[PDB]
Amino acid sequence: HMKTQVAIIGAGPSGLLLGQLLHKAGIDNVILERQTPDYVLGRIRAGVLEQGMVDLLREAGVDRRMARDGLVHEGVEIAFAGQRRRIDLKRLSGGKTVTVYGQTEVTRDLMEAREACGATTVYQAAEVRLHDLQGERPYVTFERDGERLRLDCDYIAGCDGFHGISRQSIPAERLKVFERVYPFGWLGLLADTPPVSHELIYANHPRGFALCSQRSATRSRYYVQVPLSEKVEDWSDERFWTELKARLPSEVAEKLVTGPSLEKSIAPLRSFVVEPMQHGRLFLAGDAAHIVPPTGAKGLNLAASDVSTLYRLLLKAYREGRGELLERYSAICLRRIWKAERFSWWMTSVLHRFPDTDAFSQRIQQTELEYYLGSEAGLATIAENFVGLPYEE
Amino acid sequence: HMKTQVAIIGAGPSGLLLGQLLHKAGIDNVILERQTPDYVLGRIRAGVLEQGMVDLLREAGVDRRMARDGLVHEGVEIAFAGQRRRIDLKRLSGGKTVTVYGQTEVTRDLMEAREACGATTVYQAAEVRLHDLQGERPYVTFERDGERLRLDCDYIAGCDGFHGISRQSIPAERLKVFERVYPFGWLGLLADTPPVSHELIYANHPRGFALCSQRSATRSRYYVQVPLSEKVEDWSDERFWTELKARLPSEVAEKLVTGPSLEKSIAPLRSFVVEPMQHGRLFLAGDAAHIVPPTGAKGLNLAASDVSTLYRLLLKAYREGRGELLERYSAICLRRIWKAERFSWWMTSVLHRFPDTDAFSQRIQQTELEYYLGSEAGLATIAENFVGLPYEE
Numbered sequence: 001h002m003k004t005q006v007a008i009i010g011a012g013p014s015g016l017l018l019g020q021l022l023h024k025a026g027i028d029n030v031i032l033e034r035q036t037p038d039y040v041l042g043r044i045r046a047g048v049l050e051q052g053m054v055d056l057l058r059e060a061g062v063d064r065r066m067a068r069d070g071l072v073h074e075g076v077e078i079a080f081a082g083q084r085r086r087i088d089l090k091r092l093s094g095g096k097t098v099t100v101y102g103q104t105e106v107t108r109d110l111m112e113a114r115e116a117c118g119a120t121t122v123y124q125a126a127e128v129r130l131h132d133l134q135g136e137r138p139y140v141t142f143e144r145d146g147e148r149l150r151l152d153c154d155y156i157a158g159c160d161g162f163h164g165i166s167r168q169s170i171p172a173e174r175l176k177v178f179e180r181v182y183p184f185g186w187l188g189l190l191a192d193t194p195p196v197s198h199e200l201i202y203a204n205h206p207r208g209f210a211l212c213s214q215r216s217a218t219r220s221r222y223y224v225q226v227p228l229s230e231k232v233e234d235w236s237d238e239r240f241w242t243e244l245k246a247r248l249p250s251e252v253a254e255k256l257v258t259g260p261s262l263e264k265s266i267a268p269l270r271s272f273v274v275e276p277m278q279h280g281r282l283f284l285a286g287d288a289a290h291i292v293p294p295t296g297a298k299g300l301n302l303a304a305s306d307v308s309t310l311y312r313l314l315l316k317a318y319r320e321g322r323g324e325l326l327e328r329y330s331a332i333c334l335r336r337i338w339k340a341e342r343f344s345w346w347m348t349s350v351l352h353r354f355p356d357t358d359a360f361s362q363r364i365q366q367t368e369l370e371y372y373l374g375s376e377a378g379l380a381t382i383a384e385n386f387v388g389l390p391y392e393e
Numbered sequence: 394h395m396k397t398q399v400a401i402i403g404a405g406p407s408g409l410l411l412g413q414l415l416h417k418a419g420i421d422n423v424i425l426e427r428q429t430p431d432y433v434l435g436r437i438r439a440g441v442l443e444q445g446m447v448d449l450l451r452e453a454g455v456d457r458r459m460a461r462d463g464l465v466h467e468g469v470e471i472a473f474a475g476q477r478r479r480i481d482l483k484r485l486s487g488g489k490t491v492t493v494y495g496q497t498e499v500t501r502d503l504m505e506a507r508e509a510c511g512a513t514t515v516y517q518a519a520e521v522r523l524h525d526l527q528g529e530r531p532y533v534t535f536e537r538d539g540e541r542l543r544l545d546c547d548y549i550a551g552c553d554g555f556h557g558i559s560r561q562s563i564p565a566e567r568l569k570v571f572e573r574v575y576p577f578g579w580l581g582l583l584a585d586t587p588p589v590s591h592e593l594i595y596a597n598h599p600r601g602f603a604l605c606s607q608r609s610a611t612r613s614r615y616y617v618q619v620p621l622s623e624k625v626e627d628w629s630d631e632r633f634w635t636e637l638k639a640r641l642p643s644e645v646a647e648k649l650v651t652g653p654s655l656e657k658s659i660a661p662l663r664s665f666v667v668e669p670m671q672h673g674r675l676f677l678a679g680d681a682a683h684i685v686p687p688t689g690a691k692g693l694n695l696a697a698s699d700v701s702t703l704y705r706l707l708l709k710a711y712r713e714g715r716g717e718l719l720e721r722y723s724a725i726c727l728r729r730i731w732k733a734e735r736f737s738w739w740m741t742s743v744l745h746r747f748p749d750t751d752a753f754s755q756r757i758q759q760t761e762l763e764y765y766l767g768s769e770a771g772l773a774t775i776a777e778n779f780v781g782l783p784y785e786e
C-alpha cells in the first residue's frame with residue numbers, strides 16, 4: 001500500500017493549494033486526480049481573487065508570477081437603466097481590493113510548485129473509492145493503468161468538485177442539500193484582446209446580462225446570459241460580439257477590441273450548499289461542498305477559505321495533537337459560505353433578466369440597483385461583499 | 394354651484410393634512426368624504442411616523458397633542474433564529490428617530506383643527522364623480538341627502554384611498570399598475586395594556602411573523618401573520634394571546650401584560666404602485682396612488698411625502714403663477730415611493746413565513762437577517778430606511 005498523512009482527491013485549485021500548504025508545513029500528502037494535467041489546465045473558470053486567496057497563494061509559496069502578472073482592481077462598474085455607476089471598492093471597503101489573475105494561471109503555478117517540491121500527485125487515478133471513514137485507518141483505492149492500488153492515510157480531503165466521489169462517499173441521510181438552479185447560463189468568450197475597461201463592467205440590459213472582464217492587459221473574458229436551451233455551436237465569435245455590443249453602453253461598445261476566441265463555453269448558474277461538510281476522517285472543500293452562481297466571483301475564493309480552515313485545523317491535529325478541533329471545520333466554513341452564497345444570489349437576482357417576470361419584479365430589480373448604488377450604506381454593503389468578508393479565527 | 398380652489402376627495406389623513414396645509418397658506422379647499430366623521434375615526438391603522446410626517450403635522454399647526462403624547466423611538470428589535478438584535482436607529486441613521494403616535498389620533502387632531510379653523514368638509518358626500526379633468530374648469534358632483542350638488546375648482550386632489558373614485562377617473566390606458574399580493578395577512582389586536590417593550594419587536598418565528606408595537610404607555614398593538622383564508626371570528630382574544638406568546642422570546646412572552654381587545658382585524662398585505670399619479674387637473678396622493686405591506690410602516694409616511702410635494706407645487710401655482718411645475722408631481726413622488734416600496738418588500742420578505750418555501754429560500758432568509766444585522770453597513774441600510782430617506786427638493 002501507499003501511505004500518507006492526508007489523501008487529497010482532486011488536483012484542481014482546492015487540492016493543489018491544500019497539498020502545497022501541507023507539504024510546506026511538513027504534513028505528508030498525496031493528490032489523486034482522475035484527469036491528466038493538460039485536461040485540468042484546459043479549464044478557464046475564475047478571474048477574480050479576494051485578498052484572502054492572494055495571501056494563501058503567498059503562504060503556499062506560489063505567488064511570484066501572480067505578483068508580476070496579477071492586476072489589482074480598486075473599483076467595478078454596474079451599468080443599468082441607461083446609467084453607468086462605479087463602485088469605489090477601495091474607498092467603500094475601508095481600503096481592500098481584488099486581484100485579477102486567471103484560475104488557469106493559479107493552477108499552473110501550483111502544479112509547477114508541487115512538481116518542483118517533489119510532492120506526490122497521481123494523475124489518471126481511475127475509480128477512486130473511499131473506505132473506513134469512521135475509523136482510525138481510512139484508505140483510498142484507485143486504478144492506475146488498470147492495476148488497483150491502495151493509499152492508507154489518517155484524513156481525506158474531498159477536493160474533487162461538484163461531481164466528485166467524495167460527497168457521494170457520505171450516506172445521504174447524514175447530509176442536507178440546499179440548491180437553486182437559475183433559468184439561464186453564461187456564454188463566455190476568452191480572447192487575446194485588450195480589455196475594454198481597466199475595471200469590470202457588469203451590465204443589466206433589457207436583452208439580458210453581460211459582463212466585461214479580463215485576464216491581463218492583452219487578454220479579455222466576456223459573458224452574456226443565454227437561455228438554458230442554448231448550444232455553444234450556434235454562437236459564432238461574430239454572433240457573440242454583436243450581442244455583447246447590443247448589451248453595453250454605446251461608448252463602451254464603440255471602443256471594444258474584438259478578436260477570435262481562445263475558448264467559448266456555456267456555464268450553468270447554480271447555488272448549492274451541503275451541511276455538514278465532513279463525515280468521520282473525510283472533509284469536503286470547494287466545489288465538492290458548495291457551488292455559487294458566478295455573478296459574485298466567490299467559488300474559487302470560498303475554496304480558498306475552506307482550504308485555509310482545513311489546513312489550520314490539520315496543523316493543530318498534527319503539530320499540537322488537537323485532532324478534536326477538526327470537529328469545528330463545517331461550522332466555521334459554513335458561516336462564510338452562507339454569506340458568500342447570499343451575496344452571489346443577490347448579484348444574480350439584480351443583474352439578470354428572468355423569464356416570466358411581472359411588472360412589480362422588474363421595478364423592484366431596478367429600484368434595488370438605484371438604492372444600493374445611490375446610498376453610501378448600500379454601496380458599502382456591495383463593496384465589503386465584493387472584496388470578501390473577513391476570514392474567521 | 395359650490396366654488397373652491399382645490400377640491401379634496403377623502404377626509405382620511407392625506408386629505409385632512411393637504412386641506413390643513415392649504416387652508417393655513419390661504420388656498421381655498423373643500424374636502425368631500427363618503428363616510429361619517431366617526432366612521433373615519435374608527436380605523437386603527439398606523440403607529441409609526443417618520444420625522445417628515447411629524448414635521449408636516451407641525452407645519453399644518455396640528456402638533457400640540459403629538460408633542461405631549463407621541464413617543465420617540467431610538468431603536469427597534471428583530472428577533473430571529475433564537476437571537477434578539479437591537480438596531481440602534483439613532484446611531485446608525487446619523488441621529489434620526491421615529492415617533493409612535495396612532496393614525497386615529499393624527500386624524501382626530503387634524504379633524505379638530507379643521508373644525509376650529511372653520512374650513513369646509515362635507516361628510517356623507519355620496520356618488521362623488523370627477524369631471525372635465527383636461528380643462529381649465531374641472532368640477533366634482535356629489536349627492537348630499539339625495540340632492541345632487543356641484544363643486545367647481547381649479548385642481549382636484551384624489552385622497553380617497555385604495556378603492557377611491559379618483560384613480561378610476563383616469564383612463565386605464567394612461568396608467569401602468571405594479572402590484573404584488575402577499576400570501577398572508579396580519580391579525581391585529583389593540584388593547585389598553587402597557588407595551589411589553591419600550592421599542593418595537595419584529596419576530597421571524599418558525600410559526601410565523603409576530604410584531605409587538607404600541608400607541609402609548611397604556612395602549613399596545615400586536616400582530617401575528619395568518620393565512621389569507623383566516624376569519625377574525627375564529628380568533629378569540631385568548632387564542633390571539635396564546636399564539637403571540639408562542640412566537641416571542643420566552644423572556645418577552647413571560648412579561649407580556651394581556652387584556653381584552655379594543656379592536657381586532659385582519660389586514661391583507663399588498664404592494665401597489667400606479668404610474669403616473671396625475672391626469673390633467675387631478676393629482677392622486679397616498680393610498681389612492683400606492684399601497685405598501687405594513688411590515689415597513691411606510692403608507693401614512695408616503696401619504697405625508699405625496700401631500701408635502703403636492704402642497705409645495707400648489708404654493709408655486711397659486712403664489713408664483715408657476716402652475717407648469719405641477720407637471721413634476723408624479724416624478725418627484727415616485728422616486729420616494731419606489732425606494733419605500735423596495736424597503737417594505739424587503740422587510741416583508743425577510744420576516745414572514747411563506748407557503749411552499751424550499752430549503753435554499755429558508756437559509757437565504759436566515760442569512761439575510763444574519764448579514765444585515767451583523768454588518769455596520771447592513772445595519773446602516775436598515776436604519777436609514779426605517780427612519781425614512783430624505784424628502785426631495
Ligand SMILES: Cc1cc2nc3c(=O)[nH]c(=O)nc-3n(C[C@H](O)[C@H](O)[C@H](O)COP(=O)(O)OP(=O)(O)OC[C@H]3O[C@@H](n4cnc5c(N)ncnc54)[C@H](O)[C@@H]3O)c2cc1C
Nearest residue numbers: 010012014034045046047048160161286287298299300301
Ligand atoms: C464561468 C465561471 C467563472 C468563475 N469565476 C470565478 C471567479 O472569478 N472567482 C471565483 O472565486 N470563482 C470563480 N469560479 C468558480 C471556480 O472556478 C470554482 O469554484 C473552482 O474551480 C473550484 O475549485 P475546486 O478545486 O474545488 O474544484 P474543481 O476545479 O472542479 O477541481 C476538482 C478536481 O477533482 C477532479 N475529480 C473529480 N472527480 C474525481 C474523482 N472521482 N477522482 C479524482 N479526481 C476527481 C477533477 O478532475 C478536477 O480536476 C468560476 C467558475 C465558472 C464556471
Ligand SMILES: Cc1cc2nc3c(=O)[nH]c(=O)nc-3n(C[C@H](O)[C@H](O)[C@H](O)COP(=O)(O)OP(=O)(O)OC[C@H]3O[C@@H](n4cnc5c(N)ncnc54)[C@H](O)[C@@H]3O)c2cc1C
Nearest residue numbers: 403405407427438439440441553554679680691692693694
Ligand atoms: C395594519 C396597518 C398598519 C399600518 N401601519 C402604518 C404605520 O405604522 N406607518 C405608516 O406610515 N402607515 C401605516 N399604515 C398605512 C396607513 O394607514 C395608510 O397608508 C393611510 O390610511 C393612508 O391614508 P389616506 O388618507 O391616503 O387613505 P385612507 O386612510 O384610506 O383615507 C381615504 C378616505 O377617502 C374616503 N373615500 C373613499 N372613497 C371615496 C369616495 N368615492 N368619495 C369620497 N370619499 C371617499 C374614505 O372613506 C377615507 O376616509 C398601516 C395600515 C394598516 C392597514
Ligand SMILES: [Br-]
Nearest residue numbers: 044102103104
Ligand atoms: Br482562467
Ligand SMILES: [Br-]
Nearest residue numbers: 294297298299
Ligand atoms: Br463563482
Ligand SMILES: [Br-]
Nearest residue numbers: 437495496497
Ligand atoms: Br391607530
Ligand SMILES: [Br-]
Nearest residue numbers: 687690691692
Ligand atoms: Br404601512
